[PDB]
Structure 1
């Protein structure tokens, strides 16, 4: 039965990691990953997380299954983060949240829910997006189409091209928006642009799907949710897939949420029953440890304060590295202006390096970026900045 199965293709991001591990040279610089790294180049467990895990070790008396939708406090804390305390969506009980195995799991649950229970056939994603979006939606039987996003000429949002692209989307199509810290470009809509998109989406009959992988990494928790909240003010229905992997440093514990919003409480509860059915037929119920850590932190004043400061420290270190990168390239004699990097948000930027320049950076200099030119700014440190920028200047 398995004799003639074709091997799955290499995969751009995970394949690069395989190459970095096989490479035994000494001065190597990894900008090709999707995790935060601190000034020492490590991805530590957050202190707030360790404190929460100690509390769980001391206090948990059972591992009995969670509900299909997971820990209730986790859902409540998630909705407050997304929509704001005192949001009409929360007051009117228009939103239901399922705890999921990561943001990826949330996207998969959303896709299965939509494929099985609605007329949705098509999801629009930005060009470029995280390559896993296509894989997730396709696995549910949904077609993926691209909308213009990235202005490759000046590394900004091509807003006119975006609008014109999305004219082809029909009423009842889903449109995926990265809520902040776009992956891979780090280019986000301004608030006014979000507001323009919110109005257009209502007019055109799109179902918005927001993906929040990095809430807190652009400007702050509340600011980063502005775009979502502009949509939420205008729409009867939307879905949010959110992740706590980066902002809690909980990658491998698989901590995410799928939040369903409908016009009223009766409708959302009915629809959510089918979202729960989609989860039941997938992994039954979600993993407790990471989500319990998040709920424990978010619901405790002391822990939440420690965590919010840790998140602020990550956001600020990335901002420092953006500035340092631009400054250092200038003083090492780079032949183009890199100031666009300062305007980009979160973990990722498109460097504007060509695929051949990135190949040369890996082969000649041991500097690892994704083939698209995506760099993880959190992979930069004061200690590796000079060699990194020297290598980049050399390939320009």
Structure 2
């Protein structure tokens, strides 16, 4: 009974992918990638995780099932990462972490637990946000409304429009925040704006849900967590879905976590058991290899030092490319003020190009970008920067 099944829509970036690797003209640059690439245009496996994998290969004696919530060093290590090494949330044990199939997995499992065990009906997502947000919440039956965020004109956070649309949210609604490196704009709240949002969130009764996929990409591990940390000193309950796909280069091993924080130990345990019921009814218990690698890097001082250096080198490469982009455009010369690029954090930002301009970029030059003008800065190299900027100057 499958003949009247309508084909699923062409996926936003995976379409571009197929179109690109069909254009036989190799001056082509794909900036619509979604993954990190180094100066060589390669997405390598990190040295710390290969050292990790050799260790595991030498020491694993069984592939027997992990518990519903995954390996128990993993969840003490990401909540130390998230909340700080001596957080009251950890000492009073009101946080529980379930290891999930990446950050998307963490969001579907939070959405199913919420849909089955609480009275939430709406989730507020930023306009724009990472596109797969709507699908995950909708599939668990939650409805997505969106709140204002990006100011197209100044290319900044329209904070007043943000605070103003978020008042049609009632008490008991969930509001999704990107912890650092907002996808897709790269504009983040400043710590002071985070603190007002945290204060407004208690007054209004929002359930905060942090999507935290880029820890370490804006400024550093601790610094990037201070927004979330302003929101867990103020609130009895919150959920954070984190990913290790990007900061560990472990994309395909699916490594993420769903952390539940509640008022005290008794209620977080009673709620976490229902979150465990949600995992049993989906994939039963999580993938060992990627989370195992993360646990031994983060618990070993020597391996952790290496990973931290490797993550800082990624972060700096992105910051150098954003810088090189802005002034190589100023050398190729056009009426521009692309300096907002320097102000945004992470791999993505809107270039400000129109869809007709990204179309003739693709068609006439072989530069591939997402139709919204979204560009991934990690697809730029010292070598492809000059043809890239010539192409952009020529279409402006």
Residue in structure 2 matched with residue 106 of structure 1 by the alignment = 106
> C-alpha separation between the residues in 1 aligned to 2:132 and 2:43?
22
Q: Contact between 1:335 and 1:393, CA under 8 Å: does it hold in 2? A: no
- Map Cα deviations across residues 74-106 of structure 1 (whole Å, 9 max, x no partner): 000000110000001001101000000000000
> C-alpha separation between the residues in 2 aligned to 1:369 and 1:194?
31
Q: Contact between 1:328 and 1:386, CA under 8 Å: does it hold in 2? A: yes
For residues 44-55 of structure 1, the aligned pairs below 5 Å read 44-55=44-55
> C-alpha separation between the residues in 1 aligned to 2:220 and 2:175?
24
RMSD of aligned residue pairs (Cα, Å): 0.6
> C-alpha separation between the residues in 1 aligned to 2:15 and 2:349?
20
- Map Cα deviations across residues 35-69 of structure 1 (whole Å, 9 max, x no partner): 11000010000000100000000000000000000
- Map Cα deviations across residues 311-338 of structure 1 (whole Å, 9 max, x no partner): 0000001000010000101110121101
Pairwise CA distance, 1:16: 1.0
- Tell me which moved more, 119-128 or 24-33: 24-33
> C-alpha separation between the residues in 2 aligned to 1:191 and 1:3?
53
> C-alpha separation between the residues in 2 aligned to 1:270 and 1:207?
18
- Map Cα deviations across residues 188-242 of structure 1 (whole Å, 9 max, x no partner): 0000010010001111100000001110000000000010000001000000000
- Tell me which moved more, 108-117 or 370-379: 370-379
- Map Cα deviations across residues 317-365 of structure 1 (whole Å, 9 max, x no partner): 1000010000101110121101100110011111111111111111111
Q: Contact between 1:126 and 1:176, CA under 8 Å: does it hold in 2? A: yes
> C-alpha separation between the residues in 1 aligned to 2:24 and 2:389?
21
Q: Contact between 1:321 and 1:378, CA under 8 Å: does it hold in 2? A: yes
Pairwise CA distance, 1:183: 0.5
TM-score normalized by the length of structure 2:
0.99
Residue in structure 2 matched with residue 136 of structure 1 by the alignment = 136
Name the SS of the counterpart of 1:123 in structure 2.
strand
> C-alpha separation between the residues in 2 aligned to 1:24 and 1:182?
34
- In structure 1, list runs of 5 or more residues that go unmatched: none
Q: Contact between 1:74 and 1:292, CA under 8 Å: does it hold in 2? A: yes
Q: Contact between 1:149 and 1:161, CA under 8 Å: does it hold in 2? A: yes
Structure 1 runs, 4 residues or longer, greater than 4 Å off = none
- In structure 2, list runs of 5 or more residues that go unmatched: none
> C-alpha separation between the residues in 2 aligned to 1:89 and 1:14?
40
Name the SS of the counterpart of 1:49 in structure 2.
helix
Name the SS of the counterpart of 1:2 in structure 2.
coil
> C-alpha separation between the residues in 2 aligned to 1:354 and 1:226?
35
Q: Contact between 1:12 and 1:371, CA under 8 Å: does it hold in 2? A: no
> C-alpha separation between the residues in 1 aligned to 2:73 and 2:24?
46
Q: Contact between 1:180 and 1:212, CA under 8 Å: does it hold in 2? A: yes
Name the SS of the counterpart of 1:267 in structure 2.
helix
Residue in structure 1 matched with residue 333 of structure 2 by the alignment = 333
Q: Contact between 1:212 and 1:242, CA under 8 Å: does it hold in 2? A: yes
Name the SS of the counterpart of 2:336 in structure 1.
coil
Pairwise CA distance, 1:368: 1.1
> C-alpha separation between the residues in 2 aligned to 1:144 and 1:334?
40
> C-alpha separation between the residues in 1 aligned to 2:373 and 2:94?
41
Q: Contact between 1:358 and 1:371, CA under 8 Å: does it hold in 2? A: yes
Pairwise CA distance, 1:114: 0.2
> C-alpha separation between the residues in 2 aligned to 1:334 and 1:179?
35
- Tell me which moved more, 163-172 or 364-373: 364-373
- Tell me which moved more, 18-27 or 82-91: 18-27
1:249 aligns with 2:230: no
Pairwise CA distance, 1:256: 0.3
Pairwise CA distance, 1:18: 1.5
> C-alpha separation between the residues in 2 aligned to 1:364 and 1:98?
48
Name the SS of the counterpart of 1:22 in structure 2.
coil
Name the SS of the counterpart of 2:258 in structure 1.
strand
1:323 aligns with 2:291: no
> C-alpha separation between the residues in 1 aligned to 2:280 and 2:151?
42
Residue in structure 1 matched with residue 291 of structure 2 by the alignment = 291
